[PDB]
Amino acid sequence: GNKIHPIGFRLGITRDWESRWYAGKKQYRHLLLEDQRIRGLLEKELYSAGLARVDIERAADNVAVTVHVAKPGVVIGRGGERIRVLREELAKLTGKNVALNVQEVQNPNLSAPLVAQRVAEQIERRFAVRRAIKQAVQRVMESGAKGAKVIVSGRIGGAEQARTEWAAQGRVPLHTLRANIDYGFALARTTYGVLGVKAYIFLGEV
Amino acid sequence: ARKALIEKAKRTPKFKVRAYTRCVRCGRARSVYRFFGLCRICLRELAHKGQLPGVRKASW
Amino acid sequence: GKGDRRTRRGKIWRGTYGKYRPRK
Amino acid sequence: GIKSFKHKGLKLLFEKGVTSGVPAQDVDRINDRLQAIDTATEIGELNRQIYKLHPLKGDREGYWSITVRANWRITFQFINGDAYILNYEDYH
Amino acid sequence: EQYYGTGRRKEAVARVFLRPGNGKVTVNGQDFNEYFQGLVRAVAALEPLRAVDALGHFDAYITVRGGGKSGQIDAIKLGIARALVQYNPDYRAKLKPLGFLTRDARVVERKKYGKHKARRAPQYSKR
Amino acid sequence: ARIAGVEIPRNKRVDVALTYIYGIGKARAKEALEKTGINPATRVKDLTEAEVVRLREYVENTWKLEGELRAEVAANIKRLMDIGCYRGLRHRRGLPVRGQRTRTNARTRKGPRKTVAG
Amino acid sequence: KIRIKLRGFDHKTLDASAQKIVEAARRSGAQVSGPIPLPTRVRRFTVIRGPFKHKDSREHFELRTHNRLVDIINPNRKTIEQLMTLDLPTGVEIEIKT
Amino acid sequence: PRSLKKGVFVDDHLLEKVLELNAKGEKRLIKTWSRRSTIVPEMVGHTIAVYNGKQHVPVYITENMVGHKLGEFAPTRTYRGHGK
Amino acid sequence: ARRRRAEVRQLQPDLVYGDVLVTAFINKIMRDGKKNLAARIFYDACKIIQEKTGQEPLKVFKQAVENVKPRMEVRSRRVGGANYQVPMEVSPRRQQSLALRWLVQAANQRPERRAAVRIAHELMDAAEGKGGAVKKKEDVERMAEANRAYAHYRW
RNA sequence: CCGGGCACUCUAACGGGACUGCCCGCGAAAGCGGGAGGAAGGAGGGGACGACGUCUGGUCAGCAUGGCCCUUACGGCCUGGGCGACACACGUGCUACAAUGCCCACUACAAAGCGAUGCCACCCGGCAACGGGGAGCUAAUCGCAAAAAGGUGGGCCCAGUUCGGAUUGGGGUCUGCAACCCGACCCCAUGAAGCCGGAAUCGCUAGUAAUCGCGGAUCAGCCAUGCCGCGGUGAAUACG
Ligand SMILES: [Mg+2]
Ligand SMILES: [Mg+2]
Ligand SMILES: [Mg+2]
Ligand SMILES: [Mg+2]
Ligand SMILES: [Mg+2]
Ligand SMILES: [Mg+2]
Ligand SMILES: [Mg+2]
Ligand SMILES: [Mg+2]
Ligand SMILES: [Mg+2]
Ligand SMILES: [Mg+2]
Ligand SMILES: [Mg+2]
Ligand SMILES: [Mg+2]
Ligand SMILES: [Mg+2]
Ligand SMILES: [Mg+2]
Ligand SMILES: [Mg+2]
Ligand SMILES: [Mg+2]
Ligand SMILES: [Mg+2]
Ligand SMILES: [Mg+2]
Ligand SMILES: [Mg+2]
Ligand SMILES: [Mg+2]
Ligand SMILES: [Zn+2]
């Protein structure tokens, strides 16, 4: 049980925060619990949209929130009717009065969280783990990326003995503090139990 | 950390000395930092994700 | 020494003030 | 006669019938074993094939070990018609 | 007219101002021998002077803040060493070989976790 | 000079010396000398018969000392000991009274370790 | 004499921010006292790495807060024009007391 | 060297219930979980039964034991003696 | 020291005699890094060597060290079963370390209540060839040369 | 302190600097030795960072989760007790056995932190804890804060002591609905063991060990002699 989170490790560089807003002492804890409330619903809802990140900027009673998706449609809605439901369901949580932008993911095949969830799902549907994994690494590796790697937890195939599956291609330097490796974790509830899924994608460097 | 034992939010301390922090995410009453409302664990989990604004990794 | 609660050090050690380590 | 417990769950199952300290499917199993260790007037009676009895070695010398199920053991010290320090324990 | 040289040691800063004169020293006001009242080491600070037969030829006003009177004694020693160069830059030839123009980089070591004092590791028994 | 109940502190500083009395500590020392106006530094032998009388009288009559004191203290303990007082039971049982741990470290109140088989 | 005090988590989101405030008003008031730094206050959170035991795990987390000042004496309408409503950073938060 | 300050505390469960009995003289028993309360004169003569945390022990309150606090007369643990 | 041959830390000369050997001795007196009290004691002592002795302290000191340096010492060693004490020379380096250490030790073994004195008197006695310091030294050599049979295990 | 002034210290942001780059020696090369310059070197000093895997390692008691079990209860509320028991055994520590010391007084150098009912200036009542009053601070501009070891002067005079503070009696402050069980603090009295520790055993290679005080998190208060961190003074030794 070693190695740090590849993101948290690189936060100073090659990776910005998910919530970039000043605050302090009396507020910070309140102004943060909120962010979690926010993210809470978005992930509980926008699942089929393909969640990947939830930036949350601030300045004062005019929050940001910039959900990133693979299928920006599912988010918005018909003509923009859903972005009405949510955007409203939002203030019924934070009187704060906040926006709700939506950026599209340029190739969900380079989004560790996505590749992860991608695999997490297949596994839930009962696909061959090792296959799903190799495939995933291929997709990711086959559409850009200077390196990728996926890891599935254990009880592969519902086996009584928890195992751990691999798969990796090209440089994926977890040690190099400047790599720019996207990390993504996906759960996977199952008849037999939870099985975590980890996706690592390497892009450029400097 | 049983729903039942999260009566901490009940205010009604009858006397304010019966009040107690509790994690605002897991209920981990054990190690809860004030500045975050989070316990030593969650604080570490979130710091790794970047969801803790301007909370980088220390070193010196 | 650091342990005598009624001496300079005993007070300093226990981080306190009293007839033996007045405020000034 | 059983005279002392080291395992609380074991203690409660035999004394009050409290089953919430042991596995639910091993309730009947553990019970018949404990009654056998209670009725035993000598270690020779705790010798049925289904118990896989044997004294432990090393620092656990003076102790005995009948098998409940799988890798689970009830260990104790038998002396003068009585067992002491009844423990429900994992061999590792 | 005047000469300068800073000087830092183990977290101490000393403003050294030499000035052609008697050879006295005003450290933070008090006399050299007054600030360092009873410290067998003090004598050190002025060693860079005797280095090139100064002292009884110069004079020094010195501001010192930070650390401890021991660290200050070395900062001041470096100050008097630097300043003594802005004056005559030719002093290096003899002032350096002694190492007076170096900045002792030895500082306190961070206190690492798991250990009692950065290194002093806790002890065990029948391990 | 002999002062309180069979008290004979001699050849040392008067303060120090008065300390040798049951109810006198380094505190009452500087005071009894303070009030009675006597140098504390004077060697008990070098004292004056006049000073030894003001001391002998000021001290003996101002504080409850020696035997009479041990009598009180003993009397106290006996009391909280006669009434079901827990604190009193701690005296009977011979265990620490001021709520300390008795699983380890109580030798000052228990005596020498009384090792048993284990 | 409008004293501005800028605080932020990013030492760039300020040097950028507080620097705009300098170039702007430098054409409608005095000449600004330049963005003076000011000590940073760091918050350390030393936490045990894993749950249950392992007392000596740890790993350090700090939340350093940075400050900036500036100071514009000789306030002149247009100053409060080039500044008043032309900021940009989000990871910043000001407090001003003229 | 005990100490409360200014306001000798006594729960008024038994207080206003003990003095009410002072009107008809005394009574025959009491029983409070308030071992937290100090003892005041009005309690003297009476017989309050305190809680072990398991039992209600009869404690005859005499003068000699006023200032104390009921619980000091109702032992919790048992001990009885070690071995052997 | 598996790799290098750990070089000796070079000490800054005395702030009075500019003699390094002195600093060394002062460092052996020091305890808890209270190097001032340590320096004092050795100087107060040097002035006690001036009074009670018409000689220059510095020379009394060096003379002392000299008589207290063992030239042969015994070092244990396992050789076929038993642990024979092999006798052998003493490095110039080790001679000093031992001499100074022994002085301070024997010095703090003396009776006189004053630290500075014990050092003063110990040094002198050492110069004359007497004192607890020189005892150990002569005891060491005696130890060797008394085990000079196993000296063919030269080492 | 005042005007004034950014030089200096510093504050924090950026830029430079080290690469065996230059000189001599050996080498096929990598590089080893030596020397100059330089604040610094041959990885300049300390962190973050822990590979494929190992131990059926640790935690379902943080959280998550398969299966099993309980549902007037194996759930839930409350008051009180317990987690603080002791004949004993061990681990990690604190304080100490003293004169390179202890006590009183006077006087001097630090860093990193924290502060809204919060830090608490200063003044008063109290021996004191602390209480009353009340300024500033929203905190490089006010407070915690006194750094301690240290320097100077005095006392102690080798004694279980002006060492050492356990234990116990009494008085009292403070937080808190409430301090019997079971808080910390103050003052008086008490003043224990301990005179340097058997077999055995632990740490650390320099600003390290050793020693001295300072801050923080948790937190009403606090059992902190713990933990994380700060700076002061500052060694010995390494043949092998
Ligand atoms: Mg739960
Ligand atoms: Mg609480
Ligand atoms: Mg004392
Ligand atoms: Mg067998
Ligand atoms: Mg240190
Ligand atoms: Mg380790
Ligand atoms: Mg530890
Ligand atoms: Mg480690
Ligand atoms: Mg009623
Ligand atoms: Mg070359
Ligand atoms: Mg590396
Ligand atoms: Mg296991
Ligand atoms: Mg416990
Ligand atoms: Mg143990
Ligand atoms: Mg110690
Ligand atoms: Mg007063
Ligand atoms: Mg003196
Ligand atoms: Mg010793
Ligand atoms: Mg606290
Ligand atoms: Mg502390
Ligand atoms: Zn939590």
Side-chain angles (χ1 to χ4, degrees), chain A, chain B, chain C, chain D, chain E, chain F, chain G residues 1-97, chain H, chain I:
Chain A
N2 30 63
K3 32 216 174 185
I4 31 57
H5 192 93
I7 301 170
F9 178 53
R10 264 163 285 257
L11 282 189
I13 322 299
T14 66
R15 200 76 179 186
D16 305 315
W17 285 248
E18 279 190 57
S19 302
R20 37 208 172 192
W21 43 263
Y22 180 84
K25 353 299 168 186
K26 297 178 185 174
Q27 310 175 64
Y28 206 114
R29 71 172 167 298
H30 299 114
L31 210 175
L32 184 169
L33 202 190
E34 185 153 289
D35 292 13
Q36 256 46 65
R37 290 284 174 51
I38 290 180
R39 295 192 170 80
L41 291 177
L42 320 192
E43 297 176 56
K44 264 291 188 175
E45 289 286 302
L46 297 44
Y47 184 21
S48 52
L51 58 164
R53 198 187 187 195
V54 180
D55 290 46
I56 290 184
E57 280 180 288
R58 297 215 194 190
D61 306 301
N62 271 296
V63 204
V65 185
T66 305
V67 167
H68 293 70
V69 210
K71 315 182 71 170
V74 214
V75 184
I76 302 294
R78 55 192 179 181
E81 94 77 59
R82 174 165 192 162
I83 176 178
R84 166 62 187 175
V85 194
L86 307 179
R87 209 160 190 166
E88 177 168 53
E89 237 297 8
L90 147 158
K92 278 292 183 176
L93 190 167
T94 71
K96 299 278 190 169
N97 180 296
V98 31
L100 200 182
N101 300 285
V102 169
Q103 279 190 289
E104 188 201 66
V105 174
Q106 334 67 61
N107 190 32
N109 237 37
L110 296 199
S111 296
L114 293 175
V115 202
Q117 293 167 288
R118 168 67 174 176
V119 184
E121 292 178 52
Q122 298 196 246
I123 304 178
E124 301 197 297
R125 294 177 190 166
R126 313 185 191 193
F127 283 49
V129 204
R130 197 175 297 175
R131 300 179 193 170
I133 304 166
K134 302 176 181 181
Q135 266 160 27
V137 182
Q138 261 302 356
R139 306 190 214 100
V140 177
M141 209 49 227
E142 200 161 56
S143 67
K146 289 209 300 177
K149 163 191 170 187
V150 181
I151 295 166
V152 175
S153 69
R155 277 220 85 171
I156 286 179
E160 199 161 357
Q161 269 280 296
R163 332 202 288 79
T164 283
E165 225 51 54
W166 251 64
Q169 285 184 53
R171 304 217 302 83
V172 182
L174 287 220
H175 269 72
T176 194
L177 190 54
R178 153 277 281 265
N180 170 222
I181 303 174
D182 188 6
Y183 172 84
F185 172 61
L187 224 270
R189 304 185 77 291
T190 291
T191 289
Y192 45 78
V194 171
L195 321 194
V197 176
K198 298 186 197 179
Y200 285 78
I201 314 182
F202 176 50
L203 344 158
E205 190 164 349
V206 178
Chain B
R2 301 121 60 178
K3 277 187 169 184
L5 286 183
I6 308 191
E7 75 211 305
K8 174 278 171 170
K10 278 186 187 175
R11 281 299 184 187
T12 307
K14 215 176 200 290
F15 325 85
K16 68 139 50 186
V17 282
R18 298 191 173 178
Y20 64 93
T21 41
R22 281 282 189 191
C23 190
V24 73
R25 171 176 166 181
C26 65
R28 191 71 202 308
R30 240 40 236 224
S31 241
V32 282
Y33 277 60
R34 287 176 168 172
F35 183 109
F36 293 117
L38 288 169
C39 72
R40 77 126 182 290
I41 301 177
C42 300
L43 151 29
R44 180 190 145 71
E45 304 187 322
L46 296 178
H48 285 322
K49 294 186 169 185
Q51 290 177 22
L52 285 205
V55 187
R56 199 185 190 193
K57 292 246 299 168
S59 160
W60 68 104
Chain C
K2 295 177 196 172
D4 195 324
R5 88 161 181 169
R6 68 165 79 168
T7 51
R8 198 66 178 176
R9 294 186 177 185
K11 248 62 173 65
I12 303 172
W13 191 87
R14 259 182 163 182
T16 60
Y17 301 92
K19 186 166 80 175
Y20 297 93
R21 186 204 183 192
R23 291 298 184 66
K24 270 178 180 181
Chain D
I2 295 181
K3 297 199 158 181
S4 66
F5 290 94
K6 206 245 160 97
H7 195 256
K8 192 172 180 177
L10 274 184
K11 182 174 176 179
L12 291 173
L13 178 51
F14 180 70
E15 292 188 357
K16 299 190 175 184
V18 162
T19 63
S20 48
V22 301
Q25 55 197 25
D26 294 321
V27 168
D28 305 346
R29 256 180 280 274
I30 293 178
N31 262 342
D32 305 341
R33 270 148 190 76
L34 285 178
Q35 303 302 333
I37 307 180
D38 208 40
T39 318
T41 82
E42 57 175 298
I43 206 58
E45 279 127 27
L46 293 171
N47 222 27
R48 221 205 315 188
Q49 151 126 101
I50 61 169
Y51 289 7
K52 306 280 151 55
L53 172 88
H54 58 280
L56 307 174
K57 315 169 162 191
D59 48 311
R60 299 307 307 278
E61 183 165 2
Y63 289 85
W64 296 76
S65 151
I66 65 181
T67 298
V68 180
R69 177 187 57 82
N71 56 302
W72 296 96
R73 299 292 179 271
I74 287 186
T75 64
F76 51 85
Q77 284 180 332
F78 204 106
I79 220 171
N80 317 339
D82 312 284
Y84 304 86
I85 320 172
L86 272 301
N87 203 34
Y88 182 89
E89 129 197 12
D90 172 34
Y91 96 102
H92 270 304
Chain E
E1 205 285 63
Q2 196 186 194
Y3 299 87
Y4 190 26
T6 298
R8 285 177 285 279
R9 168 63 214 294
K10 182 179 179 174
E11 197 192 61
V13 181
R15 308 191 205 181
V16 174
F17 290 150
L18 294 175
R19 294 160 177 173
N22 178 5
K24 62 179 61 180
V25 186
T26 294
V27 181
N28 260 54
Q30 304 180 300
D31 196 295
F32 187 56
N33 324 293
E34 192 51 51
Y35 187 63
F36 301 150
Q37 216 299 57
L39 295 188
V40 196
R41 267 248 301 159
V43 174
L46 313 169
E47 194 66 306
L49 289 159
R50 308 158 192 164
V52 266
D53 286 303
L55 204 186
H57 182 62
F58 272 86
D59 200 300
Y61 179 65
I62 300 173
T63 299
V64 72
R65 188 218 317 291
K69 302 201 182 186
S70 181
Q72 305 184 149
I73 299 182
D74 284 310
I76 279 177
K77 191 249 308 304
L78 192 261
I80 299 179
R82 278 172 164 180
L84 208 61
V85 172
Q86 283 200 309
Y87 173 71
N88 179 34
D90 299 61
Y91 284 167
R92 295 213 152 194
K94 255 299 180 180
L95 192 59
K96 285 200 173 189
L98 275 291
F100 291 117
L101 289 180
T102 301
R103 196 274 170 166
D104 182 288
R106 311 192 296 105
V107 193
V108 175
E109 184 163 306
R110 181 286 201 59
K111 185 283 177 181
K112 293 75 162 200
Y113 59 78
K115 299 195 139 207
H116 285 301
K117 297 175 51 284
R119 299 208 186 183
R120 193 285 172 301
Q123 84 161 40
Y124 44 101
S125 62
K126 292 69 186 190
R127 162 178 284 190
Chain F
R2 305 187 187 179
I3 285 196
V6 312
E7 292 303 299
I8 339 81
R10 184 184 170 180
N11 209 110
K12 273 195 175 63
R13 298 169 113 264
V14 188
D15 30 28
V16 166
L18 291 156
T19 304
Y20 287 65
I21 302 182
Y22 187 49
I24 309 180
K26 264 291 185 176
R28 297 182 146 173
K30 281 178 190 177
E31 193 188 69
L33 289 171
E34 184 73 62
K35 301 179 182 180
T36 295
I38 311 180
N39 181 178
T42 53
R43 238 61 205 175
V44 175
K45 60 138 300 178
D46 290 308
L47 266 179
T48 280
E49 203 56 62
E51 310 175 298
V52 176
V53 180
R54 306 182 291 174
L55 260 176
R56 193 174 302 188
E57 303 303 1
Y58 166 57
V59 179
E60 290 189 64
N61 280 352
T62 193
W63 302 310
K64 196 161 186 175
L65 310 159
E66 285 305 320
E68 176 185 305
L69 209 201
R70 304 167 183 287
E72 190 172 70
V73 168
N76 279 124
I77 287 183
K78 216 282 182 181
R79 169 203 156 207
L80 50 192
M81 195 182 276
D82 291 306
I83 58 181
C85 179
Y86 165 72
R87 186 185 186 189
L89 301 178
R90 294 305 275 186
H91 277 288
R92 299 181 177 182
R93 276 304 184 190
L95 299 168
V97 188
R98 311 195 172 176
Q100 303 104 315
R101 30 153 55 274
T102 59
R103 176 169 175 176
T104 62
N105 306 310
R107 309 325 317 191
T108 197
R109 202 103 214 309
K110 291 199 192 179
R113 286 196 209 292
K114 325 171 56 39
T115 299
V116 191
Chain G
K1 300 173 185 176
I2 293 182
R3 179 193 276 181
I4 337 172
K5 213 184 182 70
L6 274 170
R7 64 183 64 274
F9 286 159
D10 191 311
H11 85 289
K12 301 191 62 181
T13 212
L14 284 212
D15 283 301
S17 171
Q19 181 175 58
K20 297 188 193 71
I21 286 59
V22 183
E23 295 176 57
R26 268 175 178 288
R27 320 166 191 181
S28 54
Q31 204 163 66
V32 196
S33 291
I36 45 183
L38 283 187
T40 304
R41 278 204 180 183
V42 183
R43 298 288 228 63
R44 307 304 209 189
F45 304 84
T46 296
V47 190
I48 287 179
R49 264 155 191 285
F52 212 83
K53 67 194 188 77
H54 296 126
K55 236 281 157 166
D56 302 290
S57 300
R58 273 45 207 274
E59 172 193 53
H60 289 333
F61 291 137
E62 47 98 304
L63 182 160
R64 40 188 46 174
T65 295
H66 311 232
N67 314 302
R68 301 301 180 181
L69 214 289
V70 182
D71 246 32
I72 301 176
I73 292 185
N74 301 122
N76 305 295
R77 293 178 179 83
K78 198 71 65 184
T79 299
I80 309 183
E81 203 100 306
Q82 301 184 56
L83 318 182
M84 201 61 269
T85 317
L86 288 168
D87 63 299
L88 296 170
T90 304
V92 186
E93 175 259 61
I94 325 177
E95 289 297 292
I96 320 175
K97 288 186 176 182
Chain H
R2 311 177 188 180
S3 57
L4 286 182
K5 274 173 291 187
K6 63 184 89 85
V8 176
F9 184 123
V10 177
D11 279 72
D12 46 6
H13 311 124
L14 41 65
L15 185 52
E16 72 176 6
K17 177 195 299 186
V18 64
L19 40 65
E20 282 194 67
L21 307 174
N22 285 350
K24 322 84 182 68
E26 298 288 297
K27 190 184 179 182
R28 303 187 184 183
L29 260 187
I30 297 294
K31 57 162 60 180
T32 318
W33 285 239
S34 178
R35 74 215 314 291
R36 297 275 175 178
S37 63
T38 305
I39 304 174
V40 293
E42 19 290 305
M43 274 177 234
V44 181
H46 270 296
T47 313
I48 306 175
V50 191
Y51 200 52
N52 282 343
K54 165 183 178 180
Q55 302 300 119
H56 269 298
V57 286
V59 187
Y60 182 114
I61 172 67
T62 322
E63 192 68 65
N64 36 294
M65 59 184 93
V66 173
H68 299 301
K69 293 182 189 181
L70 303 152
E72 297 181 53
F73 312 81
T76 21
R77 301 162 242 263
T78 71
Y79 178 9
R80 205 206 307 307
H82 246 153
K84 56 162 50 122
Chain I
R2 253 174 213 304
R3 297 180 183 286
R4 308 171 189 175
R5 187 174 182 175
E7 23 72 299
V8 184
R9 288 180 172 273
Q10 239 53 63
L11 291 62
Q12 288 296 291
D14 187 293
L15 289 292
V16 175
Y17 297 70
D19 189 298
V20 293
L21 176 70
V22 177
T23 306
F25 184 78
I26 309 166
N27 288 318
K28 272 298 192 182
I29 296 171
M30 162 167 58
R31 55 184 65 174
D32 304 343
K34 301 182 72 185
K35 197 192 195 83
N36 215 21
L37 157 42
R40 284 180 164 177
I41 296 185
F42 176 68
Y43 292 135
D44 286 301
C46 275
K47 295 195 182 304
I48 294 183
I49 302 185
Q50 269 299 39
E51 288 193 54
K52 310 171 193 178
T53 304
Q55 312 182 63
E56 307 173 303
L58 177 57
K59 182 181 175 176
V60 177
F61 177 61
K62 299 206 171 187
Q63 179 62 67
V65 176
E66 178 60 7
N67 305 312
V68 172
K69 291 174 177 176
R71 46 178 176 289
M72 287 291 267
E73 86 186 319
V74 160
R75 279 179 163 191
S76 191
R77 170 175 175 174
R78 295 228 179 187
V79 180
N83 308 318
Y84 298 162
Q85 297 293 343
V86 179
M88 45 199 291
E89 311 171 1
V90 182
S91 83
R93 166 60 173 157
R94 191 178 173 52
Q95 272 169 38
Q96 187 166 305
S97 308
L98 294 166
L100 306 185
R101 177 183 302 137
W102 288 341
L103 293 182
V104 184
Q105 297 187 188
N108 284 294
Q109 278 297 69
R110 292 180 141 256
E112 32 263 298
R113 312 183 185 313
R114 277 178 53 204
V117 176
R118 290 193 300 285
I119 294 188
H121 289 158
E122 189 57 17
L123 276 176
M124 296 180 254
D125 271 41
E128 290 304 299
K130 51 191 178 188
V134 174
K135 178 219 301 172
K136 305 177 185 186
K137 176 274 188 161
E138 305 190 302
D139 283 42
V140 170
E141 281 155 351
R142 289 183 185 182
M143 263 292 280
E145 246 286 306
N147 287 297
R148 200 235 296 192
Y150 316 83
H152 64 301
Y153 296 158
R154 273 299 180 175
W155 188 308

